[PDB]
Design a binder for this molecule. Structure first.
Ligand code: ADP
Ligand code: MG
Ligand code: MG
Lengths: 586, 367, 181
């Protein structure tokens, strides 16, 4: 107090003495818009704690080096800035009762799985697929059955351009360039280079534990997700079956069964059928097969592709967690890195999950930054009287509320026969009582909301502003239903590496009459609500400290301060109301 | 909390909680008193053996199916089916589950009134709803339009539903399938020198109704190929050790479903009752009833239907028009997986009759 | 800013902004209530579908044309035409458009006042004018004299105009076409 001029390391010294005073674990929460230095200033904090207080970790360097590695897996390109993270990582650096540093643990929350399937128009997919089709050699790309992006179903939407420097561009062979690359070349950035970042990815792979042959089995999983997506389905049955495959998807199904290691015939009668049995319902029975619809074959292929990327990302972080494992514990310092209110001009389902997480973080900030601090001004000698905060708990119990909330109408649409995005949009305003937090696009005076018809989207007024969400493919995005015949095939793959992507608690023993067949539909919107309220119990149960990083301009240029661009990041992050409760009588 | 879908078949009463997987209990529904003198005198023997114990005890009981053409044999045996099923199979608590029972589209009142009232007073369920078996097969089928065929022993039905309203003036009930297919199979099996006169012995016929029967390519031409006997005659072995080799009758029994002159009723076969129900629907809508022709139940499980049914209807239905028949696997449990989809969906959980509503109205105002 | 030309068709209501090319909305005009029992789980279906969606639901609704014998049926269905068209077809803003409505020369009052008045109070219109459909065909033909035929389902009319005066002693209205055809 009073001997530290404002700096990031004046915050890191303060959230280590509360471990020694009141002896409660402290979570560093870095807020701010995307691409603002919340990951780079975090690496400075991890170097400060292991010098000034903590007696070091195993090795510093791996945590720093492997962070851009996991940003190949999680970063994409958004409208706001080129390098944006599509995952909310949560670092857990553990200590013990004495306060010795015992090791770390890196996880992930809010993984944008939807991005794998649909890439918009000016967005990318994940940044690892553009580093694999750009950086992989010609005695490597023919072996993994790779080609330019226009050949893959999961890369025929969005941007197919590579981020590559002028010298780099000519050093990537012409066969790896798409029609958009022929039309308008590489994407230009001074720090993002896809072929350079493939070298700084694979060098960092051998720094966390991987063998160079073991990186090739990781490349077979990424290429197997690309050659799974290419299966194109069709209709079937003289007296009605449900689904078949297309003729050109026979060569694509063989290269997919060659990369994954699961058989083609056993996958062709699993992407097309719903296997069920009559043995359970009686004393004897049989196991029949009931064909799925054509859209449910494509949505099951997409759920199977999102299931493999889910466990590959969790298997990679377990390899990294194994390169600095913890020991005995009690104190710990967490470091959150997630994007605040990243809304655009076309908003969908994933921007509503970001804004829903922001309404919970702002309700957290009203009871951890304003309530506790002004209780301490009201007890530490001065005795200061209360100033009340401006509540938003009613907006949260519109989004996630049981039976009358928005996800409780979205998840009820997918279980219905013939789901519709227009029927779900009209059911949201039919169930809603028309209160100020939500209204139809026709009730907004803005010109940008004029073009949206009342059954094609809805406007939620959030604490940081009013955001309109289009309902095109909203119901489709919430489906992720993994069929039981596909679970006893991708988990139980013939190839050992693929099989070892799965382990406890995900894998577990089962026996007859357990007593039902769950989780069926699963639900994306309640997958994120289950892991968000589970991370909320870890934020409300632990201490915290708040650092907010504001960009000086949106081009990332030195010595340039813009009074319109800096102001919008102060107005879309909770500033004015929090600096009105704090003023009070002193 | 979770509701219970219980389908009142005549088979094959089906029971399982609301979704997301196969019925928990399926059983042959029969009650049988012991019709012999059991001179061993333990004693300890049940007054009524229910199914399945009454399908082990064939020949020492006199089997009585609970419903006879959709009407109860008496509610003393019906209630006993239910009680036996709920308590010593499922092991469900009556106060814990809202229930769902099923009926037939044109079934005579007051069989749904008296039922709803007795199940509320006897088992004391906190809510109840009764769905017709055809409507539940729409939800299982997953289409928004079409004519639904619920064909079970002993009553079949033909209900047209359009996007997703019901047409009152085109609903057809045929009493042709399925107990008359059992009796006709029993009537043409005497021709091969063996007989099955008792209640228990009718079950042996029921097992041959499942496995051995086939359906013609076209009747007149299957009758032609019938003069060649090798492919026609297949030899089954029966649980009493006897081998029966049946020929013409192998395709003759399912063929009954077209032109029921064999049964002697004046009404036409499923072929023509389908056409006459389609041309009793409104002129504009008929175009999209074609290609949403959906079969269901267990008595539609003979091999040559529905592609016989398809080829015959397509000849009588308008030219150019596409007649696609819908007969997926699972149809014996279609109704039940339908019911599961219904009772799991909000908001229509709140279209069940609740205990407060029942207490006020009693056996009045069902619909 | 820009004015909006909405022709209160007898048929066949037509709508599109002023200048240059063709209308942006053509639809049969019908409002239709559901004429059968709704067995489905459902249950968001409209109690009143307007066109074009009420022509995608033939045989399961009871179609009611909103303008009969050139007179509005009731302003309940007529307003619903307007509201449906403006909001989910044209996508127009309430106070941004000066509007133009159409009429027939011998059509009884108070049908044009009550329309004009209700439309000003309901949609909050900044400026309005109501032209007879025959007068609009003068501009379309590009002549300054002649006898004009606005013939729609179910009222035709016959107005002679002379450079560029109207003749009160020669205006004829026939209930001869087109719903009677
Ligand atoms: N493979 C089969 N071939 C022909 N008939 C069958 C077959 N399996 C079952 N059945 C008949 O179907 C009936 C069961 O039909 P079901 O769908 O249970 O009707 P409900 O549901 O109305 O009771 C049985 O009586 C049996 O005779
Ligand atoms: Mg039935
Ligand atoms: Mg006219």
């Amino acid at each position: 107090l009073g001997t530290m001029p404002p700096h990031v390391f004046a915050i890191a010294d303060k959230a280590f003495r509360d471990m020694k005073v009141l002896k409660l674990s402290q979570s560093i929460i870095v807020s701010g818009e995307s691409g603002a230095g919340k990951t780079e200033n975090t690496k400075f904090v991890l170097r400060y704690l292991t010098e000034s207080y903590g007696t070091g970790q195993d090795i510093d360097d791996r945590i720093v080096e492997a962070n851009p590695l996991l940003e190949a897996f999680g970063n994409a390109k958004t409208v706001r800035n080129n390098n944006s993270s599509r995952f909310g990582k949560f670092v857990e650096i553990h200590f013990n009762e004495k306060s010795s540093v015992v090791g770390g643990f890196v996880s992930h929350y809010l993984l944008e799985k939807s991005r794998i399937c649909v890439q918009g128009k000016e967005e990318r997919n994940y940044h690892i697929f553009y580093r694999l089709c750009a950086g992989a050699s010609e005695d490597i790309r023919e072996r993994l059955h790779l080609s330019s992006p226009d050949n893959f179903r999961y890369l025929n939407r969005g941007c197919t351009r590579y981020f590559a420097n002028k010298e780099t561009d000519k050093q990537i062979l012409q066969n790896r360039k798409s029609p958009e690359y022929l039309k308008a070349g590489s994407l230009k950035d001074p720090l993002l280079d896809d072929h350079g970042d493939f070298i700084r990815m694979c060098t960092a792979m051998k720094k966390i534990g991987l063998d160079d042959e073991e990186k090739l089995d990781l490349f077979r999983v990424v290429a197997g997700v690309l050659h799974l997506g290419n299966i194109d389905f069709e209709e079937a049955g003289s007296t009605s079956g449900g689904c078949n495959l297309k003729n050109k998807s026979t060569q694509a199904l063989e290269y997919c069964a060659e990369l994954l290691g699961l058989d083609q015939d056993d996958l062709r009668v699993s992407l097309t059928t719903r296997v069920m049995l009559t043995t359970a319902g009686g004393a004897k029975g049989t196991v029949i097969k009931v064909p799925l619809k054509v859209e449910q074959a494509n949505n099951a292929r997409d759920a199977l592709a999102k299931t493999v990327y889910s466990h590959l990302f969790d298997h990679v972080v377990n390899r990294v967690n194994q390169c600095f494992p913890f020991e005995t514990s009690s104190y710990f310092i967490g470091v959150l890195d997630i994007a605040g209110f990243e809304y655009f001009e076309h908003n969908s389902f994933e921007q509503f999950c970001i804004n829903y997480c922001n309404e919970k973080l702002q309700q957290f900030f009203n009871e951890r930054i304003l309530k506790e601090e002004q209780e301490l001004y009201q007890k530490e000698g001065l005795g200061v009287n209360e100033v009340h905060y401006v509540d938003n708990q009613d907006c949260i119990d519109l989004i996630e509320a049981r039976l009358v909330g928005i996800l409780d109408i979205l998840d009820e649409e997918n279980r219905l026969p013939q789901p519709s995005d227009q029927h779900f949009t009209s059911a949201v305003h039919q169930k809603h009582k028309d209160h100020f937090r939500l209204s139809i696009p026709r009730k907004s005076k803005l010109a940008i909301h004029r073009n949206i018809r009342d059954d094609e989207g809805f406007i939620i007024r959030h604490f940081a502003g009013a955001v309109c969400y289009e309902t095109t493919q909203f119901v489709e995005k919430n489906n992720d239903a993994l069929h039981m015949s596909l679970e006893s095939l991708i988990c139980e793959s013939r190839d050992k590496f693929i099989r070892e992507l799965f382990e406890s608690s995900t894998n577990n023993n089962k026996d007859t009459k357990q007593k039902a067949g769950k989780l069926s539909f699963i639900s994306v919107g309640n997958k994120f609500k289950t892991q968000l309220n589970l991370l909320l119990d870890k934020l409300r149960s632990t201490g915290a400290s708040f650092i907010r990083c504001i960009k000086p301009n949106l081009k990332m240029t030195s010595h340039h301060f813009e009074g319109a661009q800096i102001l919008s990041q102060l107005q879309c992050s909770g500033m004015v109301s929090v600096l009105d409760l704090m003023q009070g009588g002193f | 909390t979770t509701a219970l879908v219980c389908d009142n078949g005549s088979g094959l009463v089906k029971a399982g909680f609301a979704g997301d997987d196969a019925p928990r209990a399926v059983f042959p529904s029969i009650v049988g008193r012991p019709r012999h003198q059991g001179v061993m005198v333990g004693m300890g023997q049940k007054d009524s053996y229910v199914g399945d114990e009454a399908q082990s005890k064939r020949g020492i009981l006199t089997l009585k199916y609970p419903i006879e053409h959709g009407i109860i044999t008496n509610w003393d045996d019906m209630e006993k089916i239910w009680h036996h099923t709920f308590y010593n199979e499922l092991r469900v608590a009556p106060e814990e589950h809202p229930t769902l029972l099923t009926e037939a589209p044109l079934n005579p009142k007051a069989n749904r009134e008296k039922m709803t009232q007795i199940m509320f007073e006897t088992f004391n369920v906190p809510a109840m709803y009764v769905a017709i078996q055809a409507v539940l097969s729409l939800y299982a089928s997953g289409r928004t339009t079409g004519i639904v065929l619920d064909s079970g022993d002993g009553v079949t039905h033909n209900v047209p539903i359009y996007e997703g309203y019901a047409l009152p003036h085109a609903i057809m009930r045929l009493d042709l399938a399925g107990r008359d297919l059992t009796d006709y199979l029993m009537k043409i099996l005497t021709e091969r020198g063996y007989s099955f006169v008792t209640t228990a012995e009718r079950e042996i016929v029921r097992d041959i109704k499942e496995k051995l029967c086939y359906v013609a390519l076209d009747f007149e031409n299957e009758m032609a190929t019938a003069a060649s006997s090798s492919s026609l005659e297949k030899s089954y072995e029966l649980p009493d050790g006897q081998v029966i080799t049946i020929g013409n009758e192998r395709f003759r029994c399912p063929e009954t479903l077209f032109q029921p002159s064999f049964i002697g009723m004046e009404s036409a076969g499923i072929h023509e009752t389908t056409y006459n129900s389609i041309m009793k629907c409104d002129i504009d809508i008929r175009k999209d009833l074609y290609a949403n022709n959906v079969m269901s139940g267990g008595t539609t499980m003979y091999p040559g239907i529905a592609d016989r049914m398809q080829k015959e209807i397509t000849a009588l239905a308008p030219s150019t028009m596409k007649i696609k028949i819908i007969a997926p696997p699972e149809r014996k449990y279609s109704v039940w997986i339908g019911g599961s989809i219904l009772a799991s969906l909000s908001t229509f959980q709140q279209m069940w009759i609740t205990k407060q509503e029942y207490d006020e109205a009693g056996p009045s105002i069902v619909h």
